[PDB]
From TrEMBL:
It comes from Escherichia coli. The lineage of its organism: Bacteria, Pseudomonadati, Pseudomonadota, Gammaproteobacteria, Enterobacterales. It is found in: Periplasm. Keywords: Antibiotic resistance, Hydrolase, Metal-binding, Periplasm, Plasmid, Signal, Zinc. Residues 34-210 form the Metallo-beta-lactamase domain. SUPFAM superfamilies: Metallo-hydrolase/oxidoreductase. Its EC number is 3.5.2.6. This is beta-lactamase.
Length: 229
C-alpha cells in the first residue's frame, strides 16, 4: 500500500486519475493473491471493470462506490471467464447493474461453474468491439486482442486518460512468469500482447490483474516472455 491508498474492509482502492480508481481484492490461498479491476466515473454515473474474487468482496466494491463517489453504477464489463474476473457476478446482478462480457466469456462461464453476464459483446476481425453491442459505454474502449491468457480475454482502454487495462493478459515488467497458463494459447500469446499495445498506443499507465500499475514495459516484457513459449 502506498500513500493515498484506501483500505476498505479486505479490499484496497487506489486513485489512478481524477475519474479512475483501481480496486483490489485478495484470495487467501491455504499466501494471498491480489486481483485488480477498475472503477471509472463518467459524469453522473460509475462504470466498473471486473468483479472481485467473490460475491461478498464485490458487494464491498459497490459499498465503497456508494460511500466515496455516491453515484450509481451503470454497467460492468468483465474481462474473461475466470473466478478473479467473474466471481462476483451475482452481487452485480442483485444490485441491478447491467453486466457485459465477451460473448465467448458468457458461453464459457457455465463450464467454469460461473454465471454469464447479461449482455454479450462481439468484436470485429481487428479486435475492436462492435459499437452496437457496447451501448452507452462512455469512455470505456473495449478491445479483444486475440487469445492469450485465455481464448476469451478482453482489454479496456479509458478514453480521455492515459490508462489501459490488460487484465490477466499483461504481466508487470519484472514478472518472472506469465502467471496461470492452464487455459492459455501459447502459440498466439505474444501477438495478442502486442496487439493490446498497438490498440492503445498512447496509454502510459498499464493496469493488470495481479500487479500494481506499470509502464508500457509491462506490455513489452509480457510479449518477450510469450516469445519464449
Ligand atoms: Cl489523480
Ligand atoms: Cl475489422
Ligand atoms: Cl494470470
Ligand atoms: Cl491510446
Ligand atoms: Zn484467468
Ligand atoms: Zn488472473
Amino acid at each position: 500500500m502506498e500513500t493515498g491508498d484506501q483500505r476498505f474492509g479486505d479490499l484496497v482502492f487506489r486513485q489512478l486519475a481524477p475519474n479512475v480508481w483501481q480496486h483490489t481484492s485478495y484470495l487467501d490461498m491455504p499466501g494471498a493473491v491480489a486481483s485488480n479491476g477498475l472503477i471509472v466515473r463518467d459524469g453522473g454515473r460509475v462504470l466498473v471493470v471486473d468483479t472481485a474474487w467473490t460475491n461478498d468482496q464485490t458487494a464491498q466494491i459497490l459499498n465503497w462506490i456508494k460511500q466515496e463517489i455516491n453515484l450509481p453504477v451503470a454497467l460492468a464489463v468483465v474481462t474473461h471467464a475466470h473466478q478473479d474476473k467473474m466471481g462476483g457476478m451475482d452481487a452485480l446482478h442483485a444490485a441491478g447493474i447491467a453486466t457485459y462480457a465477451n460473448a465467448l466469456s458468457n458461453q464459457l462461464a457455465p463450464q467454469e461453474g460461473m454465471v454469464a453476464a447479461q449482455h454479450s459483446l462481439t468484436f470485429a476481425a481487428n479486435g475492436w468491439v462492435e459499437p452496437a453491442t457496447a451501448p452507452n459505454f462512455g469512455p470505456l474502449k473495449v478491445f479483444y486482442p486475440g487469445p492469450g491468457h485465455t481464448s476469451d480475454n478482453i482489454t479496456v482502454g479509458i478514453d480521455g486518460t492515459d490508462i489501459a487495462f490488460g487484465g490477466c493478459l499483461i504481466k508487470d515488467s519484472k514478472a518472472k512468469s506469465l502467471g496461470n497458463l492452464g487455459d492459455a494459447d501459447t502459440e498466439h500469446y505474444a501477438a495478442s500482447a502486442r496487439a493490446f499495445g498497438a490498440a492503445f498506443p498512447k496509454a502510459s499507465m498499464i493496469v493488470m490483474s495481479h500487479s500494481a500499475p506499470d509502464s508500457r514495459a509491462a506490455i513489452t516484457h509480457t510479449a518477450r516472455m510469450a516469445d519464449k513459449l
